[PDB]
Design a protein around this nucleic acid. Structure first.
Ligand SMILES: [Mg+2]
Ligand SMILES: [Mg+2]
Ligand SMILES: [Mg+2]
Ligand SMILES: [Mg+2]
Ligand SMILES: [Mg+2]
Length: 214
DNA sequence: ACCTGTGACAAATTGCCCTCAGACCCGCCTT
DNA sequence: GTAAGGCGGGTCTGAGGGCAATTTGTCACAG
């Protein structure tokens, strides 16, 4: 009976760079917003700890540092850029944080034909944020029986997930992004994932993912 | 030229550990 | 002896300060 996150495909496919801790918080904002609004959300240290199996101390550390690092981050919807926050976060009470999400993001969070959905228990053990991005993109194509198949273009992966510059060399892309993230998904989610490479000449251009549910 | 994979090293991140003051509660002293 | 109402101290939290072991980001070399 875990909380069911649903979100517009525009967010699944947006270009941005967030840490694991920031994305964990972002799922709860999207849930809060969705039960309704004006963008103001809230996070309690003690429930976050319980949700993600952390101590109170380490939850506090994760929230605090995540919140400070939102400053200056933008989100781009394909070409329109917005800041996530329009005011700094603050604590009215011990164990409580209050946050001001950009009100212009609300429509981008929630069209009834174009959406992505997963239960939070599916992603809360993933560590690498890129494996988080990848698992959201695959869910976007999932069927009721839990299977799907999709071809993603490599340049689009690099742009939207904002992979670091040295992964433009394909052997580094293979070793440090693709193999690690397919292993995490196979190990940390109920999804079972395989893939093959599409070539054009000597260049590899797309990755084709197939998956089913356990 | 282009392509691949591997070995090295640096920078970042993980779950831990400790300390100490804030909020909350309630047994006991006082009247 | 009882009973009602305030206070000091004890427990529960979370806001800080750290750590070493692993993972991620980068580039030389060779095939
Ligand atoms: Mg990072
Ligand atoms: Mg942490
Ligand atoms: Mg060529
Ligand atoms: Mg060598
Ligand atoms: Mg050569």
């Amino acid at each position: 009976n875990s909380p069911r996150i649903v979100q517009s495909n525009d967010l699944t496919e947006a270009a941005y760079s967030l840490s694991r801790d920031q994305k964990r918080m972002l799922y709860l904002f999207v849930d809060q917003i969705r039960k309704s609004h004006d963008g103001i959300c809230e996070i309690h240290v003690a429930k976050y700890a319980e949700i993600f199996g952390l101590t109170s101390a380490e939850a506090s550390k994760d929230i605090r540092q995540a919140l400070k690092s939102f400053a200056g981050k933008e989100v781009v919807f394909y070409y329109e850029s917005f800041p996530w926050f329009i005011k700094p976060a603050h604590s009215p009470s011990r164990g409580l944080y209050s946050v001001h999400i950009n009100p212009y993001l609300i429509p981008f969070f929630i069209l009834q034909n174009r959406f992505t959905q997963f239960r939070l228990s599916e992603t809360k053990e993933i560590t690498n944020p890129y494996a988080m991005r990848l698992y959201e993109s695959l869910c976007q194509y999932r069927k009721p029986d839990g299977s799907g198949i999709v071809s993603l273009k490599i340049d689009w992966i690099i742009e939207r997930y904002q992979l670091p510059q040295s992964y433009q060399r394909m052997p580094d892309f293979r070793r440090r992004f693709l193999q690690v993230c397919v292993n995490e998904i196979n190990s940390r989610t109920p999804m079972r994932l395989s893939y093959i490479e599409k070539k054009k000449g000597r260049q590899t251009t797309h990755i084709v993912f197939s998956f089913r549910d356990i």
